[PDB]
């Protein structure tokens, strides 16, 4: 299930896709705050119908700052605690030229 409120340690990368995410909604990761959630959390056989797509966000903390962004996409290559933030969201927490940041904390929220 989706463990709302449970903090996890992991890593964050970012991506820049523009199109439709796995939730079936239009996304522009260069200009919108959102997150792609690792595949291990997805449950429904049709991704547009996943509960991750209905009112679920994440709160991501790094270096004393926390942001809150909606789940809009799936990261098939991400391990369990590796989130792929939009470029726009990632830049609010860390410099884009860092590329990957280990040691973030994140949790699903509603």
3-state secondary structure of 46: coil
How far apart, in Å, are the Cα atoms of 61 and each of 24, 29, 89?
27, 19, 12
Residue written as token pair 């705050």: 33
Q: In degrees rounded to 5, what are phi and psi of residue 83?
A: -100, 150
Closest CA to 32 of 80, 79, 81, 67: 67
By DSSP bridging, strand 65-75 and strand 35-38 are parallel
- Which are the contacts of 26, defined by CB distance < 8 A and separation ≥ 6? 19, 20
Experimentally determined by: X-ray
């Amino acid at each position: 299930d989706i463990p709302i409120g449970q903090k996890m340690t992991g890593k964050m990368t970012y991506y820049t896709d523009k199109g439709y995410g796995a939730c079936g909604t239009p996304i522009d990761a260069s200009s919108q705050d959102l997150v792609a959630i690792p595949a291990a959390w997805w449950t429904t056989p049709n991704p547009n119908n996943d509960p991750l797509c209905r009112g679920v966000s994440v709160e991501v903390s790094y270096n004393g700052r926390t942001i809150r962004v909606p789940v809009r996409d799936k990261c098939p290559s991400c391990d369990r605690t590796h989130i792929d933030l939009s470029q726009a969201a990632f830049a609010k927490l860390a410099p884009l030229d860092r590329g990957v940041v280990n040691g973030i904390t994140w949790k699903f929220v509603r």
